[PDB]
Amino acid sequence: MNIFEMLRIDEGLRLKIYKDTEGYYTIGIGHLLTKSPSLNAAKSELDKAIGRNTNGVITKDEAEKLFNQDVDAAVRGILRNAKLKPVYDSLDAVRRAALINMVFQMGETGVAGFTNSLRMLQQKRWDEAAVNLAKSRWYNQTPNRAKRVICTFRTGTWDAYKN
Numbered sequence: 001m002n003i004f005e006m007l008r009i010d011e012g013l014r015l016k017i018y019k020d021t022e023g024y025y026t027i028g029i030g031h032l033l034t035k036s037p038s039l040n041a042a043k044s045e046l047d048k049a050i051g052r053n054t055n056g057v058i059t060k061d062e063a064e065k066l067f068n069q070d071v072d073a074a075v076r077g078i079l080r081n082a083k084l085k086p087v088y089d090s091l092d093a094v095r096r097a098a099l100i101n102m103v104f105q106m107g108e109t110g111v112a113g114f115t116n117s118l119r120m121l122q123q124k125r126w127d128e129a130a131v132n133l134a135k136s137r138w139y140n141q142t143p144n145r146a147k148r149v150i151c152t153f154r155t156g157t158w159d160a161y162k163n
């Protein structure tokens with residue numbers, strides 16, 4: 001298991017534009033296209049992202065290319081953020097993946113707002129961090145995924161993603 005396999009499980013793979021859990025146009029492996037309700041706007045974003053006039057459909061290779069860029073972007077968002085970088089640096093590689101996962105789903109600014117959870121993670125108070133992370137819109141709106149991510153912070157193992 002690794003961050004790519006983890007997010008591929010949490011995000012799925014769909015080759016045509018679809019709406020994500022928040023109702024936003026998305027494609028591939030959780031590649032958010034736009035928060036606009038305009039499908040035409042989402043299609044324009046897709047063409048710009050892929051570099052060709054699509055029909056709203058991409059190939060698996062193209063989905064994986066966006067996915068690699070998006071994982072990279074999540075890590076760079078962490079490393080450039082003054083609140084997220086110290087927490088990331090303090091974590092083992094398994095829990096680093098859990099933090100990347102959160103930033104992939106919610107963005108750098110959103111995760112950086114989890115001030116008290118971040119402090120508990122940096123303190124390595126894993127059960128307390130788990131309780132605090134669940135008191136969130138994130139947990140309430142995507143509880144199964146949030147439970148997998150929180151369990152990964154709790155244990156530092158991949159048990160929530162095996163079988």
Ligand SMILES: *SC1=NC(C)(C)N(O)C1(C)C
Nearest residue numbers: 150151152154155159160
């Ligand atoms: S969270 C969670 N997942 C498993 C089943 C590995 N656990 O033992 C916890 C920590 C309750």
Ligand SMILES: [Cl-]
Nearest residue numbers: 128131132135
């Ligand atoms: Cl709490």
Ligand SMILES: [K+]
Nearest residue numbers: 011012020030
């Ligand atoms: K998804």
